Amino acid sequence: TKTTMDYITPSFKPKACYVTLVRNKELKGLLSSIKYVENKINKKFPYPWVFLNDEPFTEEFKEAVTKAVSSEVKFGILPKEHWSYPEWINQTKAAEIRADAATKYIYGGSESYRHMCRYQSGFFWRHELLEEYDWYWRVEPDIKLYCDINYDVFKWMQENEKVYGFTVSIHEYEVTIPTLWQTSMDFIKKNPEYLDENNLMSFLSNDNGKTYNLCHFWSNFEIANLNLWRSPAYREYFDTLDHQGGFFYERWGDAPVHSIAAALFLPKDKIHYFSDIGYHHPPYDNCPLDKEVYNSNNCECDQGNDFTFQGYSCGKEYYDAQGLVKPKNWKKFRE
Amino acid sequence: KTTMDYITPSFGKPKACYVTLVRNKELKGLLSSIKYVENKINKKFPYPWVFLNDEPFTEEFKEAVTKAVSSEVKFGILPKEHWSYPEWINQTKAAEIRADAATKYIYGGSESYRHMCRYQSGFFWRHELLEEYDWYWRVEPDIKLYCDINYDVFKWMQENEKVYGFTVSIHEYEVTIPTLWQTSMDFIKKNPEYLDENNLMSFLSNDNGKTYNLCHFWSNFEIANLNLWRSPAYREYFDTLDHQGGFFYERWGDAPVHSIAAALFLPKDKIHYFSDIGYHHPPYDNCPLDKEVYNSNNCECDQGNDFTFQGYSCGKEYYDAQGLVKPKNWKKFRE
Ligand SMILES: *[C@@H]1O[C@H](CO)[C@@H](O[C@@H]2O[C@H](CO)[C@@H](O[C@@H]3O[C@H](CO[C@H]4O[C@H](CO[C@H]5O[C@H](CO)[C@@H](O)[C@H](O)[C@@H]5O)[C@@H](O)[C@H](O[C@H]5O[C@H](CO)[C@@H](O)[C@H](O)[C@@H]5O)[C@@H]4O)[C@@H](O)[C@H](O[C@H]4O[C@H](CO)[C@@H](O)[C@H](O)[C@@H]4O[C@H]4O[C@H](CO)[C@@H](O)[C@H](O)[C@@H]4O)[C@@H]3O)[C@H](O)[C@H]2NC(C)=O)[C@H](O)[C@H]1NC(C)=O
Ligand SMILES: *[C@@H]1O[C@H](CO)[C@@H](O[C@@H]2O[C@H](CO)[C@@H](O)[C@H](O)[C@H]2NC(C)=O)[C@H](O)[C@H]1NC(C)=O
Ligand SMILES: Nc1nc2c(ncn2[C@@H]2O[C@H](COP(=O)(O)OP(=O)(O)O)[C@@H](O)[C@H]2O)c(=O)[nH]1
Ligand SMILES: Nc1nc2c(ncn2[C@@H]2O[C@H](COP(=O)(O)OP(=O)(O)O)[C@@H](O)[C@H]2O)c(=O)[nH]1
Ligand SMILES: CO[C@H]1O[C@H](CO)[C@@H](O)[C@H](O)[C@@H]1O
Ligand SMILES: CO[C@H]1O[C@H](CO)[C@@H](O)[C@H](O)[C@@H]1O
Ligand SMILES: [Cl-]
Ligand SMILES: [Cl-]
Ligand SMILES: [Cl-]
Ligand SMILES: [Cl-]
Ligand SMILES: [Mn+2]
Ligand SMILES: [Mn+2]
Incomplete structure (x- = not known):
């Protein structure tokens, strides 16, 4: 039996690209993001x-x-x-x-936002222009890169055999994904082979799968291996969510969809948090806390506004699930 | 002697200041905001x-x-x-x-955030440094002023007898203010003299006051007359809120507090929306939709991301309560 990681190890200069889904009317904010990158x-x-x-x-x-x-x-x-x-x-x-959710939650009444979510979830990784690559770095308009990055990130991902890279994580507004979790757990029940024995379930759940703690990686920033989304496991997963209807009957975001898949279908050491990359996507920051990394890369963010370890962020849940030692002053962010 | 009686006297250059409550660790974000102002x-x-x-x-x-x-x-x-x-x-x-709310909503587990909200609600306007002023313009770090402002806004507020000026409006997360409305409604039942007969209640409620629609003005951006907060009506209202406990047993922000007071205690024509001031406080923009204002003032924002008329914003509600004619393409923002 060929496993999810059998579809990925082969790709371990790398064939990579930055990828941006964007509107014409967002030109000024995109140009800004481009100047940073x-x-x-x-x-x-x-x-x-x-x-x-x-x-x-x-x-x-x-x-x-x-x-x-x-x-x-x-x-x-x-x-x-x-x-x-x-x-x-x-x-x-x-x-x-x-119509009913117009004023209930952000993007509640938006038709376009939902097609975008479904797009990022199951189709951007199938676009013709991405076929030739193995890695992509998603970039949105109105973003900031606070620090210099002095190494080839894609090359690093390849050498270190990482599959999913992120910076910000956060708890989702549950009102937008009432049935997403149950739908995903039924999926795993019918397809136990896609559940990696050494996965990151602990980041997504505090009761071993019973319920979702709402944690997810903020998908506006992703540096990952396209073959994950191209694996049989992810294709079947997306198709299941697509037939359930939540992208349109609720407001399922691609971030929680990509995150549940990453955290359950892969050995956890395939997920990587870029603690060294300064980044901002309204309204949250990921600001390198390591003094040396911060100084050496001339970071322009306020370490004190780093979102990582704040209550509503899931940086704490991530470090604990990976077994990473949290920086010594993390508790200050929960004040 | 009513509320307006305390404000009309302040209607030479007007006595005004910019006011910024901020932390030492937010210097870079503050310096950026200063560059814009x-x-x-x-x-x-x-x-x-x-x-x-x-x-x-x-x-x-x-x-x-x-x-x-x-x-x-x-x-x-x-x-x-x-x-x-x-x-x-x-x-x-x-x-x-x-502790229980740490992961439930933004700043849910934050002790310092609640002192900040109580502060902006009942104490910044009586800090000894603001005593000599009649007007203030609240400025926060990590803000953007997208366009030129070619007139003295304070002078303008004074000449036109306006009391509260804002840009962004939005629906509050009710989980942070469960009992705010009930507390405010009992205050008015107990003090009918403070409820102006031409108030902006319709901005706050769709059912003549029975329930709160959660609409409020975003307080990170306020150009207002200090004499409103110094009036008996507001002083008594704050004291009532302070004694109820909401700033600590829930997470009452100063935004909904300032707004409920402005919309109820004043003739609605004392409130003004600066449709001409381009502004950004993560993650939302107020971008002039009027093409001539947008171009004459060299705005740097994408009109396409203006938040004013999106569903989760309260621009529609505000325009309707004021009888203001909504821009021609306003519905595009609800798509
Ligand atoms: C200032 O605020 C504080 C904080 O709220 C007030 O103190 C609190 O006061 C209330 C009411 O007086 C107490 O409620 C009673 O709680 C006990 C259960 O106590 C245990 O659980 C508590 C809750 O635990 C969860 O939630 C907390 C907080 O979110 C979390 O931290 C936990 O992890 C849990 O998720 C817990 O807080 C208690 O902790 C304390 O004690 C333990 C044990 O020694 C210590 O380890 C802790 O460090 C800490 O000191 C504790 O673990 C319930 O059993 C009570 O319900 C009974 O009585 C009611 C009386 O009206 C009745 O209605 C109920 O039905 C029920 O009665 C039933 O059982 C009776 C038993 O004989 C029968 O007679 C009866 O017929 C019926 O069958 C009650 O809900 C809080 O415990 C208390 N909290 C603390 C921390 O002290 C304080 O009063 C405020 N001060 C002022 C001036 O107002
Ligand atoms: C498709 O959705 C519409 C809208 O909800 C459904 O129509 C409603 O169906 C209920 C159920 O009896 C009626 O009470 C409403 O009066 C209907 N409203 C409208 C807009 O006609 C419709 O049943 C659904 N169709 C499918 C595929 O089940
Ligand atoms: N082409 C296109 N891109 C869109 C559309 N809606 C959103 N996007 C892009 O999708 C990404 C996420 O959208 P955004 O509005 O920033 O969502 P947010 O991050 O939740 O505020 C950004 O790269 C947008 O430019 C749309 O209708 N068409
Ligand atoms: N001095 C001080 N200022 C604070 C504190 N918390 C927030 N502020 C200021 O209060 C304003 C609102 O805080 P902010 O974190 O921006 O809140 P948000 O807009 O809800 O994300 C900003 O101008 C901050 O700099 C605090 O604990 N101390
Ligand atoms: C802070 O807001 C953004 O992030 C959350 C969590 O991913 C989404 O639910 C929301 O629509 C926006 O994209
Ligand atoms: C989008 O988040 C910001 O705005 C809402 C509504 O004003 C506040 O409740 C929240 O704490 C932040 O300040
Ligand atoms: Cl919206
Ligand atoms: Cl269609
Ligand atoms: Cl938080
Ligand atoms: Cl104290
Ligand atoms: Mn975005
Ligand atoms: Mn702020």
């Missing part, structure tokens, strides 16, 4: 940058982006089948759901 | 800047801030009675609430 790592360790959109990019947009990125840029449009209601979804039901 | 308006219309901290500011902090600001700067420490548990609060109980 350029200055902190891309001019030193260049990798192609793929930009995707559910609509065609404007010439003004492509012209601006092409000038701002020093490495090769690729622009692609999303196939409509990766951004439209599946045949089995009741659209009237979905519309009433959005 | 300086380049967008302070160089043109200088006003003294007040910096407050529950602990003393370091020399490094003061030297860096004095240098960054072009107008006068003033540094102050908070009286301990404006930042400590009242004698009527059960601290063991407050501690249990914090």
Whole structure:
């Protein structure tokens, strides 16, 4: 029997790319993100940058982006089948759901946000432009890279045999994923072979699977191996969630979907937290706490606003599940 | 003598200041905010800047801030009675609430955050350093002013007799304010004289006051008349909230508190929405939708991410309560 890791070890310069799903109307915020990535790592360790959109990019947009990125840029449009209601979804039901949740939770009434979530969950890793790569680094507009990155991150992932890399983790607003967990546990019950014997269940749960603690990796920042999403386990998992309906009948985000899959389908030493990469995605920061890393890489963030060990973050849950020794002053963040 | 009677007298250059409560460890984020205020308006219309901290500011902090600001700067420490548990609060109980909520909502387990909320609610406006002023402009670190502001906002508020000025509005997480509305409604039943007959109740409630829709103005951005907070109505209202205990047994923010008071205690035409001031406090923007204002003031935000009319924002509610004509494309933001 070929296992999930059999689909990944083969890929252990790496074939990697930055990948960005973005709207034309977000040009100023994207250009900003690009300037950070350029200055902190891309001019030193260049990798192609793929930009995707559910609509065609404007010439003004492509012209601006092409000038701002020093490495090769690729622009692609999303196939409509990766951004439209599946045949089995009741659209009237979905519309009433959005109408009702319009003011209930962030993006509650948004139709586009849900297609985006489903896209990031099961289709961005199948886009034509990503076929040739084994790794991607997701980047969004209005992001900051607080520090210089003095090593090739993709190369590091390959050499160290890591599969999923992140910076921020946090507890999800449960009102958006009421049935996500139960749906995922039934999946594992019918497919025990996909549950890695040495997985990270402890990050996701405090009672060994009974319930979800809502913890997940913040997907706006990911540096991972595309073959995880391309494995049989993940494909079957996504298809199950896709038929259940939560992307549209609730508001399932790709972050909790990617995270449950990573934390359950892989040996836990395949997940890696980039404690050394300064990053901000509104409204949270990951600011290197190690003095030497912080100084050497000229980090521009306030260590005191590092979200990692704050109550609502899941940095504590992650360190404990991995067995990592938390930095000595972590408790100060819970004040 | 009613509430307005305490405000009309302040209606020479107006007595005003910027006011910033901040920590020593947030210097970089504060310096960034200062750069924005300086380049967008302070160089043109200088006003003294007040910096407050529950602990003393370091020399490094003061030297860096004095240098960054072009107008006068003033540094102050908070009286301990404006930042400590009242004698009527059960601290063991407050501690249990914090521990239990650590992972339930943002700042749920934070002790310092609650002192901060109580502070912004009932004490910043009576700090000795603000006594001589009639107006204040609250500024937080990690903020952005996206556009030029080519007129003296304080002067403008004064000439037009406005009392409370804001940009972002949003629905509060009810889990942080379960009994706030009931406490506020009993206050008004007990003090009918404080409920202005032309109040903005419809912004706060969809059922004539029976329930709170959770709408409030985002207090990180406030340009307001200090005499409102100094009025008997507000003083008594705060004292009532302070005695109820919500700042500690729940997690009452100053945002919903300031808003309920403004929307109920004043004629609704004393409240003003700065549709022309580009602003960002993570993770939301107020970006001028009016193309001429956007271009004449060289805005740097993406109009496409303006938060004002998104479902979870309260811009629609505010516009409707004020009888303001919503911009032509407002519904696009609800998609
Ligand atoms: C200031 O605030 C504090 C903090 O709230 C107030 O103290 C609290 O006061 C209430 C009411 O007086 C007490 O409630 C009683 O609790 C016991 C159970 O006690 C155990 O569990 C507590 C809860 O544990 C969970 O929650 C906490 C907090 O979130 C977590 O930390 C835990 O992990 C749990 O998740 C726990 O707090 C207690 O801890 C204390 O004691 C232990 C044991 O010695 C120590 O290790 C701890 O360090 C700590 O000191 C404790 O473990 C219940 O049994 C009581 O219910 C009975 O009585 C009621 C009376 O009205 C009745 O309605 C109930 O039905 C029930 O009665 C039943 O059983 C009776 C038994 O004879 C029968 O006679 C009866 O017919 C019926 O069948 C009650 O709920 C809190 O325990 C207490 N908390 C503390 C920390 O002291 C304080 O009062 C406030 N001060 C002021 C001035 O108001
Ligand atoms: C698709 O969703 C719609 C919207 O909820 C469903 O229509 C409602 O069905 C209930 C059940 O009897 C009725 O009481 C409502 O009056 C219907 N409302 C509308 C909008 O017609 C519909 O039943 C669903 N169809 C499927 C595939 O089950
Ligand atoms: N092409 C396209 N990209 C979108 C759309 N909605 C969101 N995105 C992108 O998806 C990512 C997440 O969206 P964002 O609005 O930032 O979501 P948030 O992080 O939850 O606030 C960002 O890269 C966006 O630019 C959409 O309708 N079309
Ligand atoms: N001196 C001091 N300022 C604080 C403290 N907590 C928050 N603040 C300030 O209060 C404002 C609101 O705090 P912030 O963390 O930005 O809250 P948020 O906007 O809800 O994330 C900011 O201007 C902070 O710098 C504290 O414990 N001490
Ligand atoms: C802080 O808000 C962002 O992150 C949470 C947790 O992932 C999402 O639920 C939410 O829609 C936004 O994307
Ligand atoms: C999005 O989060 C921010 O805004 C809400 C609503 O004002 C507050 O409750 C919360 O603590 C933060 O300040
Ligand atoms: Cl469709
Ligand atoms: Cl929304
Ligand atoms: Cl105290
Ligand atoms: Cl928190
Ligand atoms: Mn984003
Ligand atoms: Mn803030």
